[PDB]
Swiss-Prot record, chain A:
It comes from Lactococcus lactis subsp. lactis (Streptococcus lactis). It is a single-pass membrane protein. Involved in the post-translational modification of the lantibiotic nisin. NCBIfam families: thiopep_ocin (TIGR03891). This is Nisin biosynthesis protein NisB. Keywords: Cell membrane, Membrane, Transmembrane, Transmembrane helix, Transport. One of its GO terms (cellular component) is plasma membrane. The gene is nisB. InterPro entries: Lant_deHydtase_N, Thiopep_bacteriocin_synth_dom.
Curated annotation (Swiss-Prot), chain B:
It is found in: Cell membrane. NCBIfam families: thiopep_ocin. InterPro entries: Lant_deHydtase_N, Thiopep_bacteriocin_synth_dom. The chain crosses the membrane at residues 825-838. This is Nisin biosynthesis protein NisB. Its main location: membrane. GO terms for cellular component: plasma membrane. It is a single-pass membrane protein. Involved in the post-translational modification of the lantibiotic nisin. Keywords: Cell membrane, Membrane, Transmembrane, Transmembrane helix, Transport. To B.subtilis SpaB and S.epidermidis EpiB. It comes from the Bacteria.
Length: 962, 965
């Protein structure tokens, strides 16, 4: 069911057959200093470490910082021959395909894919902005959003890393931001727009107010347009020309462009001096740690079998199926918190949603920022207990027998299980290293494993050649077409990363219909952040909508950027645009604490290499570091895993055993461990000049749309002693009935005397309590009269405390405010009669029971609503009178609502939803917290009908920490 | 540090050398039905099963209960030869001692320790109550307690169901119970007491209400006095005489006593016919599933080495030391919930404490009421992350190498740890089986392992012989002497178990100064439940106090009754009287989920045998149960462990393999597992007639209480719009200051004009909010006026919602209500000045930051309290610019600080109370001025030291209700 696409092949430039072992560090520096390819590789990747090695080979590098130079150069040597991961001059990227026969020779030719350093370039533009503000034009930053009397940003940039800044919302800010919304405006024009409405005596205030907006990036200049996204040398230069009077930047910049173009055509290794020039010009313009990005691409075309294509598709099936056991996630708990605050009939503006005071904050696992209210970790189920038992069992088995762990043992388990079988998972990208064992070619999953972000790995390389652009577009096309059918608008989120040294990773080509910019600007169609609303669909899944066009959105970060470094809102928009199930393989979660893990395999694929944990506390004194790793049986060759980089180490190499001793005592300082993996021969499969290359691959594998805008607090919240009085009476479940029987009647009478009405509700959340809501002329007079009764209920220990709370009306849920009022009329009339049914159920001398009264009043409800019908009643019933008493009141109120519903052409769908509620809140009053027995009373009721058929220039700037 | 006492020896009566193998079940049933000793053993231990076996080999047993009868009888056969655990006619108890040499021959003679069946006896006595009421006298059940308009019992018994029952609190119940509260009262006199203030026309109602009180066990009769606890045949018999005119009960009971007394002198095996008499006699009186308890005791005297005394004491040190790593428990979390509700200056009545509506519920782990409000599992540290890493490491090491796990690897670690602390742990009882491996004598800990309950194992056997009574009293003597030193009054909790079929286990003989009775009564001095109040030490530790005598109490259940089957309140009283640390060995917790655990060892003691988990789900096709236990390398002999019973099995025995196959498919359908353990040869160490006995042993090893009774809800809670108006204003932390700057002043001005006062406070949990408290004449006018300001703060999105809540005054913390009022005056004056300090800090032109203003106000508070006397101020501190002093509201503050100080001096507050109050008052100023993240606060004290150093009719109702538990 998973179909493997053509794939990226990444392989190293040097060949590991030319690697040589070293025994002395000084010895390394010389072989390296005579290695032409290596020296250019280092000058490009890491200019500052490069200059330090020059300072070495010219006598005076201060001899305290010599070892660090050593350790670094050795690791860079290792990284240059081993380790296939794409990065400037070290290794190259190419397209692979499937055919009827394998092909591993690289016949094609190598290109340089050159980019400015994004951190350099951004720093430059900010230099120019400060110089030429009055000659530029500025637009509004989409990151801005008004909240109350303040103007926030989703995140802050110009900071020195600690502070988040917000300003006050003033007339001046309004004029300026409205004037620059979806528009650029020369500095001068902005200034006048405010003076043409304030006076010319205020020109000076304007110039600095505007000055402040540009400094704290509430306004971005025309220079930042397409700077990151679809950068052009020519449009960049044109823009700079017009503003650069003294030719201070334009002349040096063209030399840089010229040299880069010259550098482009040079071979790899015989280009060090041309590169030296390139830094020199750029260094003079502005120093940065790095100046140039390079992505090596290539003409080659590696081929895989048909046995290989199935083998990979088999693995994609298996990995996908394990998700079937993800029952409950952090987003699910988030979804639940959403449903309790907002109804199920509300779309909420996303900045409001994520506010921890006016909304509900973020998911438990989110960190930017983490919630500041207290919360305990939500229950999450990522695999079943039965499954966890099998996994631990397979583990102790494999350890005891000194064997591999065979994951395929559970393949049937995952395929035969489907339950609700929707196939939520839409596609994968796996990351596989190529290697050998016992002279046989094998796949090895990286620690990376992969993810469900199609296009993720290719997005960076897409713009480097039309064959790549074509490749990207095809991978992306799966999701894009499935979006076309469901009439969903896609958006790339395009942003200036908070941490500016992460800028080079943001990069990708926009393949989506629109764009969400942050601290930047593009030519694509852009969504405003404050137009984004979040709702929940009929099957209870999050969705985003642009309220201004009513379109539905899915958002994309089509890159290898860490998806957890985003502000909460951005992370959310991403995550609801995928399936929430891939990410937590069971074996990773279950085996993580063990200090030895067997190799994990699946159908001859190595799922994970064997892993070791080595602890500081174990090197002892009569137990050497070498003797220790032999005691735990680490092989001659192995990796140490720092993060997402591993370094090759050999037990037989003296330098390497040093590296190990260094690593083990830095973790020692921290009461920590160090991670080892076993090694695979990975040097002789992909070849070029009859020499092997280290290689990895990345294989991609492939209705009531209503919903009301959330109504404002001012219209929806009914404050104490306005129209309503709302009390939370804390009463234990065992005693609520007695309160309703023997206390409520008195209360109802008091409120009757004042010609008002009341309805109540039963709740469990916080602690058990009854929610009283009273509508009446003199509310405070009513409170005082109630209070005596409450005092008695406290005295008898029926009720502990109470609160007087704001009544938050469920407007959206019950139609308009109009339909709401009549619903409330039903609530009261229903409340009015409940003590009577309860008296009645309680009575022994005859009848009834509870569940009879339940079934009977739902029926009375349905008859009333649908006018003694049955075809109307049954069609409603398939998705889910005679006694006088006070039912005259209830029937009457049900009547008025049915009439007003019909009077305003409520759709059938709206009417059912509203009706279900009225029945639901009745069930709440009559009997307790009811769950799915709601649908059983509905299920039971089918049968019965079946059988019948001036200082606003202030900018009060504030900063917070973290 | 642990010194081993004389120990209990428990050994089997039969000898395992005379055990025999069987091949088919019918072969067992026949061998058994002609085995003299087994039949008397069976007739005593399990009467209904005996009759099922009789019904079987006489044709009459329905052929579905045949399999059950078969397995059951096999296991009881195994259990009579194997299994040293003490229990009627199967095995016997004796005292063991240490000397200079081992001695394993049992020389003594075996005696019967016979007791009636407690379920039999109590059920009988309950009938007599219903029959002979008017001829009896009654006392109040201590389990009773008033709460509001109801009368509950901490648990219910007359439940022959799963229901808990409570009645209405009526004037009649009050009269009857206060009358019967401290002693017994003739049926007649209770009745008069009711009619003498209701009328003689109510006599008929009195008789009925009183009855229903007895029916539902709200009252105990004089029959129950010492019934369970210190039962005497004659004091019991005499009482029955006085009420039984028709001699319907007395004549058979005397027969029962005579038959039992005759049974006593009979040997083991030769009594089947005498027992049958006892059953027939007692069954005619009252049928029950069991009739007779027997605890076999013996004068024998097994001896252990001096190497053995070290070996055990070494093990006790090690086990005890591991508790050193228990940092935080479920009781530690509860202690914290206590302090959040009540603070530290309150003693709370235990029934209120445990109420989930009016109190704080129970500890997280309690289940007799598990809490009904939602709660997430508390953080607990029973071992460190480093320790856990070590155990896992040792686990993977041992499995990979097919070795034992040597707990010795960490003896050095636990021993050298935390030498500066005294260990709360005052003693252990360890439970050890005796066995061999490679012909060498070894100790093996039970899975039970043991506990920190001294006297637990001996309490049951205590009354059976003067040598036993002496032995028990000696173990208990440690605890009891130390209780005397600390001036602590001890209580045994004496109770009829909720599950009336557990009746026989409650039994222990009373060694403590008082007794806390439930559904029974004794002759000792008794504590009332509703007199027990709970407080906290200066050292943050729970204690119990009898409010009527001001005594401090520690509580004891000196038996083997499962300490988790108690009502919460009872469980709590038990557990706070011990260390909260022993019970969770780290390896037990950490290895718990592995479906193979290696043998755990320590100094030649086997701490735990190797354990296996075998699953139903794994017997499918080509995989037979025998093939399965072979693949997991189950040894030839092994135990299957159901619960507190293990059954012996051998792979070479066909029947044993049948038992197993049955065990696994009963687990299959429920999709769970079965537990196996390795076997140790254990039959020929302790001997009698030159034949071995299966044996285990159980070895025991060895200030200002102020605090106010909690002020009542009615007296402490100030309802909305009476004297006070209280708003919870929900405002984010980042913007609270701003609110205090540009909104509170307007509010303060509103309430000012109405001639009242307000004080505020910052809180963080639930969600951040400011607690506003206003005192004023016309509160509802003040609300409406304020309300506009608040709506303006909503608009600006500074405040989201607010609540109007009940103000729970902190009386105890701030002295009486008198000193409270005066503190409140300070709270308000202090609140008045915070907007200026905040402006003054917000002002750039100052150069006064937050921490400068802080110390200056902290300094000024102290100059006030101790009237500029720098030397007193320093003494206070040693247990832990001008524009402000001239500021109009700081003068108000100074006055208020003075007025409190006067009343404090006037009421002879102990010096420490005063220090404490000041500290609180200073703490809440800090709260108002700056946030609430703390202890960088007591840093304010340290620096402030520097500044002062450097200045040198229908209420007969019984409205009975039932709940569903």
């Amino acid at each position: 069911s998973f179909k493997a696409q053509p794939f990226l092949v990444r392989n190293t430039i040097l060949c590991p057959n030319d690697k040589r072992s070293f025994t002395e560090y000084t010895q390394v520096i010389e072989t390296v200093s005579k290695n032409k390819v290596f020296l250019e590789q280092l000058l490009l990747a890491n200019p500052k470490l490069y200059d330090v090695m020059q300072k070495y080979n010219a006598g005076l590098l201060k001899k305290k910082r010599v070892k660090k130079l050593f350790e670094s150069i050795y690791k860079y040597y290792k990284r240059s021959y081993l380790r296939s991961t794409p990065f400037g001059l070290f290794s190259e990227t190419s397209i692979g395909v499937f055919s009827k026969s394998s092909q591993y020779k690289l016949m094609g030719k190598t290109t340089k894919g050159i980019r400015l350093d994004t951190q350099w370039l951004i720093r430059l533009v900010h230099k120019m902005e400060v110089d030429f503000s009055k000659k530029l034009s500025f637009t509004r930053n989409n990151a801005n959003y008004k909240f109350g009397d303040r103007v926030f940003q989703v995140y802050t940039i110009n900071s020195s890393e600690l502070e988040e800044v917000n300003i006050k919302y003033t007339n001046v800010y309004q004029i300026i931001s409205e004037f620059c919304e979806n528009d650029y405006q020369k500095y001068e024009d902005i200034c006048e727009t405010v003076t043409l409405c304030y006076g010319d005596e205020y020109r000076e205030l304007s110039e600095q107010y505007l000055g402040s907006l540009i400094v704290n990036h509430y306004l971005i200049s025309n220079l930042q347009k397409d700077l990151l996204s679809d950068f052009s040398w020519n449009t960049f230069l044109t823009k700079v020309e017009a503003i650069d009077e003294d030719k201070k930047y334009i002349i040096p910049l063209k030399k840089v462009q010229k040299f880069i173009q010259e550098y482009s055509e040079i071979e790899i290794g015989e280009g060090i001096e041309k590169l030296k020039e390139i830094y020199q010009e750029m260094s003079q313009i502005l120093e940065n740690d790095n100046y140039i990005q390079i992505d090596l691409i290539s003409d080659s075309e590696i081929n895989f079998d048909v046995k290989q294509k199935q083998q990979l598709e088999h693995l994609a099936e298996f990995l996908g199926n394990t998700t079937k056991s993800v029952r409950r996630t952090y987003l699910d708990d988030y979804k639940d918190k959403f449903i309790e605050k907002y109804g199920v009939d509300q779309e909420v503006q996303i900045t409001e949603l994520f506010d921890s005071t006016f909304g509900i904050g973020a998911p438990y696992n989110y960190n930017h920022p983490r919630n500041d209210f207290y919360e305990s970790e939500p229950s999450t189920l990522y695999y079943s207990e039965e499954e966890r038992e099998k996994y631990l069992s397979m583990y102790v088995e494999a350890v005891k027998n000194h064997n591999v762990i065979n994951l395929d043992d559970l393949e049937s388990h995952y395929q035969k299980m489907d339950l609700e079988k929707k196939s939520e998972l839409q596609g994968l990208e796996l990351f596989l290293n190529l290697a050998k064992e016992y002279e046989k070619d094998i796949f090895i999953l990286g620690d990376i494993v992969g993810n469900n972000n199609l296009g993720g790995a290719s997005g960076r390389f897409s713009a480097l050649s039309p064959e790549l652009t074509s490749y990207h577009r095809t991978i992306v096309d799966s999701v894009e077409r499935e979006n076309e059918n469901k009439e969903i608008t896609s958006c790339e989120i395009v942003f200036l990363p908070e941490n500016i040294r992460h800028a080079n990773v943001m990069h990708t080509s926009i393949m989506r219909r629109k764009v969400l910019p942050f601290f930047t600007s593009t030519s694509h169609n852009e969504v405003l952040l404050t137009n984004i609303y979040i709702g929940i669909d009929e099957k209870e899944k999050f969705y985003a909508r642009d309220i201004s066009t009513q379109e539905v959105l899915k958002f994309y970060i089509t890159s290898m950027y860490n998806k957890t470094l985003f502000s909460n809102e951005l992370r959310f928009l991403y995550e609801i645009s995928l399936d929430d199930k891939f990410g937590n393989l069971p074996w990773e979660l279950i085996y993580r604490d063990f200090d030895y893990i067997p190799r994990l395999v699946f159908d001859e694929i190595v799922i994970s290499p064997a892993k070791w944990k080595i602890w500081g506390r174990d090197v002892n004194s009569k137990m050497t570091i070498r003797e220790l790793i032999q005691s735990k049986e680490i092989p001659k060759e192995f990796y140490i895993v720092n993060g997402d980089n591993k370094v090759y180490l050999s037990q037989k190499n003296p330098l390497d055993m040093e590296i190990l001793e260094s690593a083990i005592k830095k973790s020692s300082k921290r009461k920590d461990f160090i991670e080892l993996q076993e090694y695979f021969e990975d040097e002789n499969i992909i070849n070029k000049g009859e020499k092997g290359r280290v290689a990895d691959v990345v294989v991609p594998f492939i209705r009531a749309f209503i919903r009301e805008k959330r109504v404002s607090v001012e219209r929806r919240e009914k404050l104490p002693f306005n129209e309503w009085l709302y009390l939370k009476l804390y009463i234990s479940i065992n005693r609520q009935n007695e309160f309703l029987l023997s206390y409520l009647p008195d209360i109802q009478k008091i409120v009757a005397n004042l010609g008002g009405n009341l309805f109540f509700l039963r709740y469990t959340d916080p602690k058990p309590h009854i929610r009283l809501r009273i509508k009446c002329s003199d509310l405070f007079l009513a409170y005082g009269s109630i209070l005596e009764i409450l005092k008695r209920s406290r005295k008898n220990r029926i009720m502990s405390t109470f609160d007087i709370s704001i009544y938050d009306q469920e407007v959206e849920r019950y139609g308009g405010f109009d339909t709401l009022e009549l619903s409330e009329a039903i609530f009261c009339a229903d409340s009015k009669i409940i003590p009577n049914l309860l008296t009645l159920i309680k009575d022994t001398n005859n009848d009834w029971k509870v569940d009879d009264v339940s079934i009977l009043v739902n029926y009375l409800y349905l008859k009333c609503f649908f006018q003694n019908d049955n075809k109307k009643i049954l069609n409603f019933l398939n998705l889910v009178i005679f006694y006088d008493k006070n039912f005259k009141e209830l029937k009457h109120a049900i009547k008025n609502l049915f009439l007003k519903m019909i009077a305003q052409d409520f759709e059938l769908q709206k009417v059912y939803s509203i009706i279900d509620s009225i029945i639901h809140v009745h069930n709440n009053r009559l009997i307790g917290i009811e769950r799915d027995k709601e649908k059983l009373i509905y299920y039971t009721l089918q049968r019965l009908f079946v059988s019948e058929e001036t200082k606003d220039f202030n900018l009060d700037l504030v900063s917070v920490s973290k």
